[PDB]
Amino acid sequence: IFVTGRIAFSLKYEQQTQSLVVHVKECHQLAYADEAKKRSNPYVKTYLLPDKSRQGKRKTSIKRDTVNPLYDETLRYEIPESLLAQRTLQFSVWHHGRFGRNTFLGEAEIQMDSWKLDKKLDHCLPLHGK
């Protein structure tokens, strides 16, 4: 698939709970996983690299038949702050398809070390292929 589009999200670090709060807002102009029928069924998944273990994983629900999914779903990583400065938060977007096959629709990252300084709230990143 030729990756297109963007992902919007916000990031906060709550001390009141010692956790990175990743709010996934929406993707725009995802590629069609099924070009025949013009269709994608997208969900977003996150890792705080390099933990690519399963419970290092977070994910939104799946939207059916859209390339502009609107999620507004919060994913949350409980994690003291010292260990965050080492990580990269990686979003990847997936088509949940026939027989449950999942097809890659694009990826984007943000390094926490530089983010940690001003902790800018809102972001919108273009997706990359692999």
For residue 50, cis peptide bond before it (omega within 30 degrees of 0): yes
* Method for this entry: X-ray
Residue 93 CA to chain centroid, in angstroms?
6
Q: Which of 26, 85, 87, 102 is nearest to 56 (CA)?
A: 87
Q: What is the residue-wise DSSP string for 49-86? A: ET--SGGGEEE----SS-SS-EEEEEEEEE--STTGGG
Is residue 89 classed as helix, strand or coil in its secondary structure?
strand
Q: Which domains are assigned to the chain?
A: 1-130 (2.60.40.150)
